Amino acid sequence: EYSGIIYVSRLPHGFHEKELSKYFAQFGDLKEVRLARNKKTGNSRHYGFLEFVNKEDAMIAQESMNNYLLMGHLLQVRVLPKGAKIEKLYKYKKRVLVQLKDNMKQKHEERIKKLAKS
Amino acid sequence: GYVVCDSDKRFLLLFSFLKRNQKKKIIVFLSSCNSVKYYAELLNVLELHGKQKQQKRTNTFFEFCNLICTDVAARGLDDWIIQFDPPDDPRDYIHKSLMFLTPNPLNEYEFQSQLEKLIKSNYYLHQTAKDGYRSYLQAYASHSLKTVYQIDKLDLAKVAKSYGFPV
Amino acid sequence: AIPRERVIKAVNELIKFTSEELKKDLQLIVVNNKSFTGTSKSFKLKLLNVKHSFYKPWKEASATAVKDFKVLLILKDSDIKDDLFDQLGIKVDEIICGKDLKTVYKAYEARNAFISQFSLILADDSIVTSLPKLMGGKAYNKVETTPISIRTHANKEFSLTTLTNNIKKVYMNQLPVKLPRGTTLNVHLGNLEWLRPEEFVDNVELISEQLIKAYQIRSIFIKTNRSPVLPLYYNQDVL
Amino acid sequence: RSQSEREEEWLEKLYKKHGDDYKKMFFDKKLNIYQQSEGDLKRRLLRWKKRNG
Amino acid sequence: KVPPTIAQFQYTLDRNTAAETFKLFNKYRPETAAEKKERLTKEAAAVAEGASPKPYAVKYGLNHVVALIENKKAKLVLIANDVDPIELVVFLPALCKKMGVPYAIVKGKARLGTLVNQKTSAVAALTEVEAALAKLVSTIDANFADKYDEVKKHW
Amino acid sequence: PYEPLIDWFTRHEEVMPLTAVPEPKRRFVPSKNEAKRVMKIVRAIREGRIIPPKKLKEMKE
Amino acid sequence: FVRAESIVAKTLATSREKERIKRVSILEDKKAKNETQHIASGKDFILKDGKPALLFIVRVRGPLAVNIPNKAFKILSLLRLVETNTGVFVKLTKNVYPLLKVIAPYVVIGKPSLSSIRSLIQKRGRIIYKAEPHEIVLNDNNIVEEQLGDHGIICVEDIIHEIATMGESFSVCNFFLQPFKLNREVSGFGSLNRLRKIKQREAESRTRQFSNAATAPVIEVDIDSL
RNA sequence: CCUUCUCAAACAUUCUGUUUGGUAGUGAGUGAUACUCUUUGGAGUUAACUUGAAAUUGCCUUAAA
């Protein structure tokens, strides 16, 4: 059996979650959509996961878009067996729009003593 | 010692080894006399083989005494002594010295799109390239080597001789 | 003046210690700083004046070494109009325009291969600002793969003499360096073969003086790739 | 027989560029667009010189 | 009943991949008679008063297209389904598969020829291209050559 | 009546091309068959029976 | 149903438009503060200032089907130029100057002429008022004499003078004019219209170009084209 | 199926030298020792290298009909 989760790697650049939800909503009532975004930067990894409320539609969508040649690169859409849910995919964001002399002297002395190790 | 070198990067390895000196007498032995004629034009050491004029060959060798030679012509005429193409005899070379092979004694060592563009653009360097490639192929097939026979695919041999499509 | 005694000691101690390719040969100087450019990451390549034309030995070693680098000059549409090189002791390798880089290199593999070919990345100041959107991360992920800025325009028009004199000066004076938003900065120098001790001390003196003048540097250490951090100057008085 | 006007001008340009160095003319992609061999080059250049000294 | 060797056509490339292939081929349309004539006239006028990179164009003629095939010079082969003499194209997919060259089938010989000026072209091929050719070849493979590799079966 | 075919031959791929025809110079030369037409047009222009393209635009009265 | 390519293209275009708008707004905010210390430029220029000048603006179609963005959509709603091929006269000012860049990609601006303004006013005009859905044209000056004329704008010639001379009643008349819906260029389809549209589209790229630079000079073209 | 910020200012003017500003990037993944800060939370920085736009889970409609 195939689970409702759909694995699609090789996603086009800029193919955010909103576009995936909008396009897959045509096929029916999709459950959830998530994308693997890097913590350091919001740029995605070009691979994400999404789930459908119906397992039949889940594989129907993969069959229809199995090797569809979208702009940039084709979609590597695959369907996993029962289980393998969409657990844990966070929507990382960049950010909101926008005494000492003693330690330094000690470190300098330590470096001056250590340089003799050469 | 012998050096393991894949045919896909044989040209790159040879170019690096040549660039490692730029002057010292890096003696190299080639199985095919036609191949050296094609390799001489790839420097864009001097040509020294038996197929060319004997007088000019001798004069060039005398000048160099102050290379690019085949197995047969190197015998008796004489930093690194190397053999790239398969030897004319498996043991005549063993009798500094280093070897290159990858179909299968002392030790072993450890560790270019312009040519591809030009091969299809220059007619003469294309005819010479294919001539050398298939002369090396004939030498490899005609040689009764102990453990080397017709098995290796030419898909990498063509690349080794700068050729893209299989001739 | 910077302490020349420490430099004289280092030019012998470090040479003995080092005497793998970049670790043994690649000379560099590291300058400690107290933050930079606030909350911004402008990719401006700062230039430092060098008393010696270290580019000539750099290309001499590269010519005699396996790694042969190429100089790429990014130009504009008007610049297409061998005159761009006939007036240059120094020879430019390749000249390309931004028109091609934005489309003919859509394949990231080809873009990476093209970038790795060159090391002295030169570009017109007018088009330098638009480069990062084209060459991608890999070019800006290494100091030697990012575009350097050279002034070629004169009276808002192309000038062959302006390009020639500026490129000659850069080849016999300027040295690039990045501007990270951090407390550490690196300025590559050259190879172990570069000049002799006293000449090397003179070479480092101007670099250190310019670094001190340009900004309130914190400390500078004489260094070599993965070598011990030999102290040079202690500029804690600013703190 | 003689060389054509355009052919004569091309041969004169090649001779000025290289003189009698047919080997250099062979690799002269700027003028040797057809990749003339070392023999044809000299065969045409001798006839060109016959009328030019 | 059609034999297994026949009916390999009619089952052809999908809509999106076919459109992408047509768009890619349109980028290398051969110079037409009028354009070639005007270019030659301009060249003559320039030379008559006061040396170019090798051109690129799609291959369409059956004889020379097959000549490029077998020599491994054909990077991609596109074949029409509605060709009247089927025997002209029955062996072409087999030859392409034997030589290890990507191949594809399309519906409508006239649409095949519309991208090469001629009224009809039966088959078409490409010799040189920029980088989308590899992606198109992979898509064609995964959608026709590997998904329908069982063409030898059925009747 | 209804049996599948056998791909006994369409399972291995040839390496070397079936023929070793020598490479003709024309493939490496700029279309001498086209230089012929260029020179024919040059001759026609010299004879004056063919109008230069510029005069075509200059005479669109 | 809609194919995937359209959604991806719309998203890519929207991202670029939003980035350009944000960059332009951020640069203009710093320019207004007069700091002008770490920005590309502080001055303004036009090539082919914020001084007063009456200009004509035409709403052009394109770029690609970008979802209505808040800033540009609101700016257009202020001028009520949502419909394509619609134009209206606006008084150029330093405060209004950044609006050009804000809505530059969607509109084309230039300096009109007295003859062009007179012809446009006398050939087209709307008065959407007394149910009051009627699009009555400026048939007679009686409406101008009654509803207008409080400030002395009694006839169409007075409106022309106010528009060209930037009179006090310029705001009142401009709102009353219900800016004109200019006819589209080709205005057809079929055998000849397809080729005519294709031929005309080439000039659009060479005329309606956006450099997307934050300090890009104001795009200006002669209104004599139409 | 879509094209990326291809110069803004001052001295001086020698067919233009000097000075400043303007460059927020595809990710995946390896990695040779140091900088501080920041007050236990880890935050940014210093060489070099692989990549098929490869990849499995970090809390306004005449681009219409």
Author numbering:
A (entry chain o): 88 to 185, 195 to 214
B (entry chain D): 267 to 310, 316 to 337, 343 to 354, 359 to 375, 389 to 397, 411 to 417, 426 to 481
C (entry chain K): 31 to 49, 72 to 133, 138 to 144, 148 to 298
D (entry chain v): 175 to 227
E (entry chain G): 70 to 119, 125 to 203, 208 to 233
F (entry chain m): 239 to 299
G (entry chain t): 55 to 102, 136 to 217, 222 to 317
Question: What does the primary publication say about this deposited structure?
Answer:
Nog1 is part of a range of intermediate nuclear to early cytoplasmic LSU precursor populations and its association with LSU precursors was previously found to be independent of the ongoing expression of rpL2, rpL25 or rpL34.
Expression shut down of LSU rRNA domain I and III binder rpL25 led to similar effects on the pre-LSU folding pathway. The factor and r-protein composition of state Nog1TAP_L25-B largely resembled the one observed in state Nog1TAP-F. On the other hand, in state Nog1TAP_L25-A several factors binding to LSU rRNA domains I and II and the ES7 element could not be detected (Ebp2, Brx1, Rpf1, Nsa1, Rrp1, Mak16) (compare Figures K and L in S1 Appendix). In summary these structural studies indicated that both rpL25 and rpL34 have a crucial role for the stable positioning of LSU rRNA domain III in nuclear LSU precursors. That effect is likely still increased in the subpopulations of misassembled particles for which numerous factors were not anymore detectable (Nog1TAP_L2-B, Nog1TAP_L25-A, Nog1TAP-L34B, see S1 Appendix, compare also with mutant LSU precursor populations depleted of factors in).
